[PDB]
């Protein structure tokens, strides 16, 4: 009667499931399910649809590009390509501040 049903969907990776709760407020339905999702380690962009009273908590914000593992020329941010006084090629991880030998030729053929 005075109680209205509300849904929840936990779109997570190691935590996936659905549930339902009864409340007289929308804010209360949120707050109760937040404590519910909390103990499951699920928090995310809290979306809602007024047609179905479905609260949707998605674990994440985006997925980003699926392919593009550094396949472009030039040096990437924080990288230095410098040579020794003998013409030997070495790289500098300025991100961690260390030297590293990263050449496309393994063993220098």
Curated annotation (Swiss-Prot):
Autoubiquitinated. Ubiquitinated by the SCF(FBXL15) complex, leading to its degradation by the proteasome. It comes from the Eukaryota. Residues 73-106 form the WW domain. Transmembrane segments: none annotated. Detected in heart, throughout the brain, placenta, lung, liver, muscle, kidney and pancreas. Also detected in spleen and peripheral blood leukocytes. It is found in: Nucleus. E3 ubiquitin-protein ligase which accepts ubiquitin from an E2 ubiquitin-conjugating enzyme in the form of a thioester and then directly transfers the ubiquitin to targeted substrates. Polyubiquitinates POU5F1 by 'Lys-63'-linked conjugation and promotes it to proteasomal degradation; in embryonic stem cells (ESCs) the ubiquitination is proposed to regulate POU5F1 protein level. Ubiquitinates EGR2 and promotes it to proteasomal degradation; in T-cells the ubiquitination inhibits activation-induced cell death. Interacts with POU5F1, RBP1, EGR2 and SLC11A2. Interacts with SCNN1A, SCNN1B, SCNN1G, WBP1, WBP2 and ATN1. Interacts with ERBB4, NDFIP1 and NDFIP2. Interacts with ARRDC4. Interacts (via WW domains) with ARRDC1 (via PPxY motifs); ubiquitinates ARRDC1. Interacts (via WW domains) with ARRDC2 and ARRDC3. (Microbial infection) Interacts with adenovirus type 2 PIII. The C2 domain is involved in autoinhibition of the catalytic activity by interacting with the HECT domain. A cysteine residue is required for ubiquitin-thioester formation. This is NEDD4-like E3 ubiquitin-protein ligase WWP2. It comes from Homo sapiens (Human). The lineage of its organism: Eukaryota, Metazoa, Chordata, Craniata, Vertebrata. The chain holds residues 438 to 480 of 870 of the full protein.
């Amino acid at each position: 009667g005075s109680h209205m049903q509300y849904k929840l969907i936990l779109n997570g990776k190691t935590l996936k499931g659905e549930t339902t709760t009864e409340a007289v407020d929308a804010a209360t339905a949120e707050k109760v399910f937040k404590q519910y999702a909390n103990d499951n380690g699920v928090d995310g962009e809290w979306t809602y649809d007024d047609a179905t009273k479905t609260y949707t908590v998605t674990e994440g914000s985006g997925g980003a590009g699926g392919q593009g593992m550094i396949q472009e020329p030039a040096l990437p941010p924080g990288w230095e390509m410098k040579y020794t006084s003998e013409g030997v090629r070495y790289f500098v991880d300025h991100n961690t501040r260390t030297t590293t030998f990263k050449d496309p030729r393994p063993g220098f053929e």
